Paper text:
Pro-survival homologs (six in humans: Bcl-2, Bcl-xL, Bcl-w, Mcl-1, Bfl-1 and Bcl-B) are structurally similar, but oppose apoptosis by binding and inhibiting Bak and Bax, as well as sequestering pro-apoptotic BH3-only proteins (BOPs). Interactions between BCL2 members are mediated by an amphipathic, helical BH3 motif that recognizes a conserved hydrophobic cleft present in the effectors and pro-survival proteins. Here we describe the computational design and experimental characterization of specific, high affinity protein inhibitors for all six pro-survival BCL2 homologs. As confirmed by biochemical analyses and X-ray crystal structures, the designed proteins engage the BH3-binding grooves of their specific target pro-survival BCL2 family members.
Thus, in lieu of generating a combinatorial library, single amino acid mutants were screened with BLI, and three mutations improving both specificity and affinity were combined in αBCL2. The SSM-guided mutation of 2-CDP06 core residue G107R is likely responsible, requiring the first and third helices of αBCL2 to shift relative to the BH3-mimetic helix and positioning the third helix much further from Bcl-2 than the αMCL1•Mcl-1 binding mode. SSM-guided αBCL2 mutation G107R contributes additional polar contacts with Bcl-2. (B) Designed αBCL2 residue R50 is tolerated by a more spacious Bcl-2 binding pocket and interacts with Bcl-2 E114. Like αMCL1, αBCL2 expands the classic BH3 interface by 452 Å2.
Author numbering:
A (entry chain A): 7 to 32, 87 to 209
B (entry chain B): 3 to 117
Write the structure that this text describes.
Amino acid sequence: TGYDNREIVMKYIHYKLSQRGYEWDASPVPPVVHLTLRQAGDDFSRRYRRDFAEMSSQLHLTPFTARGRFATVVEELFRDGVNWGRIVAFFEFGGVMCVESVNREMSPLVDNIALWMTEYLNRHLHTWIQDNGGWDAFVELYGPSMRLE
Amino acid sequence: DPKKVLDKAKDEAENRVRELKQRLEELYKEARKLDLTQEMRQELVDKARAASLQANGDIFYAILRALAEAEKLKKAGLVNSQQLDELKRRLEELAEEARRKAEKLRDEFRLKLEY
């Protein structure tokens, strides 16, 4: 059980891209999960924007390098555990690599990057998400921050 | 007392930065014993950026928890919508202060790496 993580990833990357004028075409999850995650992610990027900017500027990115870069970051991110904030950092990291890809005229890399996010979720984060109440726990944790906006 | 929520979140954030300093010292110590190429050095800088990402994640998470507590206080009537607005404001300046400190820790990691 729990929600389909491919769907979560697709909607999330789709929204990051369409919010920048790019149209990306490539158990069923409630709207509220999607909406909660795009808002927590936008909130994270607003606070930590300067850090991603320094990352993404210092990024030589090629179809053949991209996976290694993604791997190093997420390995260090989850080295000694998971929590919801690391998960949100994860999502926005993968979003920044997608946006950089379209910026550098390497749009087909967004499909690969969405695959890597999906496999990392399914293979490494899933059982921790489930043990900690699923994506519904996240919705509940972030609600108090939502109700301010 | 509404201030105590902000104080616990500060405590957590300041601890997490000290853990970061620690982690970047581990990273620098096991860089030192080796002797590096450009590829290897860029990898360490990237691990340092990822270690900061992680700290930022943890502090973001500490802030989600502070806001959830804040909401309970509001329901118990121990804080109001304005003080909750002030708390939000302080928690964002906090995130930025912690972020600035982590960046200084990075820049100093590199300066140590190369020189």
